[PDB]
Amino acid sequence: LVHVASVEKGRSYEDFQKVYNAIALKLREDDEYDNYIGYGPVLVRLAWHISGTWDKHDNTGGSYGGTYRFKKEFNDPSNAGLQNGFKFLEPIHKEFPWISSGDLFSLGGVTAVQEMQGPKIPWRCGRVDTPEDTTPDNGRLPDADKDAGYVRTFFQRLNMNDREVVALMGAHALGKTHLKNSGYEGGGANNVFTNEFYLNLLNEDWKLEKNDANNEQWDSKSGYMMLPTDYSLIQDPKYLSIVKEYANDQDKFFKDFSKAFEKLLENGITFPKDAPSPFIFKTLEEQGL
Numbered sequence: 001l002v003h004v005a006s007v008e009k010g011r012s013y014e015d016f017q018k019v020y021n022a023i024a025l026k027l028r029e030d031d032e033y034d035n036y037i038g039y040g041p042v043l044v045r046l047a048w049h050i051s052g053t054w055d056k057h058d059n060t061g062g063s064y065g066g067t068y069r070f071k072k073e074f075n076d077p078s079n080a081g082l083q084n085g086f087k088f089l090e091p092i093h094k095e096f097p098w099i100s101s102g103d104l105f106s107l108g109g110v111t112a113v114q115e116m117q118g119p120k121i122p123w124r125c126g127r128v129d130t131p132e133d134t135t136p137d138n139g140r141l142p143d144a145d146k147d148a149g150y151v152r153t154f155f156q157r158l159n160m161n162d163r164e165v166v167a168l169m170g171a172h173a174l175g176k177t178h179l180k181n182s183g184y185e186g187g188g189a190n191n192v193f194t195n196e197f198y199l200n201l202l203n204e205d206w207k208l209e210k211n212d213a214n215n216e217q218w219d220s221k222s223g224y225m226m227l228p229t230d231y232s233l234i235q236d237p238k239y240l241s242i243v244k245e246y247a248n249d250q251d252k253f254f255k256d257f258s259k260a261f262e263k264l265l266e267n268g269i270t271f272p273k274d275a276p277s278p279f280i281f282k283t284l285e286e287q288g289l
């Protein structure tokens, strides 16, 4: 199964920077969502969930086909709450109807991370919408109530190693859990990209509590929380070493996150040898906008 990237006809860096800017401007404007968190975190989650269906064994799923637009994937219980991100992007797509759905969803994630003062994430175009029958079945996204062994094994399907996994999980510094979406409640409600996930794991006094949905979670008196899969990163000796590294080196975390997140967004896609190189978008701030 081969998915070859194909650049939207006649489009170049300037076209994609315009789309970036439209998303970034809307992020700034629609700032009231989720008690003033804004849409940044839910867009990062959307990019991850559309990519995280990938299976290295047969090259099914992944960001290429834009299949989240189809009912089966849109209504995956693991995707509860992402409709809010989809709605955010819908007027963007109407203004730029030439962009593919996978390109839009993935670009949304890049734009959100950058606009939240995260690292630059190189991004490549050319995902092509594929038909409804290529939509992966539900159940390929991970459970939260599990341990380190589960996390490790799970991410092997996505061709991610221990360092990639720990880097990617740092995105949990963003946003929050919502009881109605996932059965977990709480979080920092933060919309600036930092390495604070690692600092919080190492520095907070964590208590194992049961929430209103009857699920266990780790809570601190500061008001932070961790999922069991989050906490597993300090229970496993290999993960713990990497957690400590990122807690003590913000730049290293940024660099590793950028590489891992691009890889996540590109899994399953074959780029022809004459495909454009990756784009690095300027932020609104860099443009003076």
Ligand code: HEM
Pocket (backbone or CB within 6 Å): 041, 042, 044, 045, 048, 080, 081, 142, 143, 144, 145, 151, 168, 169, 171, 172, 174, 175, 176, 177, 178, 179, 181, 182, 183, 184, 227, 229, 261
């Ligand atoms: C074992 C892997 C993972 C599990 C079990 C997991 C689980 C969850 C759950 C249960 C929520 C709360 C959803 C809700 O209630 O609204 C959440 C939120 C989030 N996740 Fe993960 N996640 C995982 C990996 C990742 C990765 C790899 C990324 C990105 C690189 C990511 C980014 C986020 C973001 C940004 C939010 C906040 C969304 C919001 O504020 O609306 N997650 N995750």
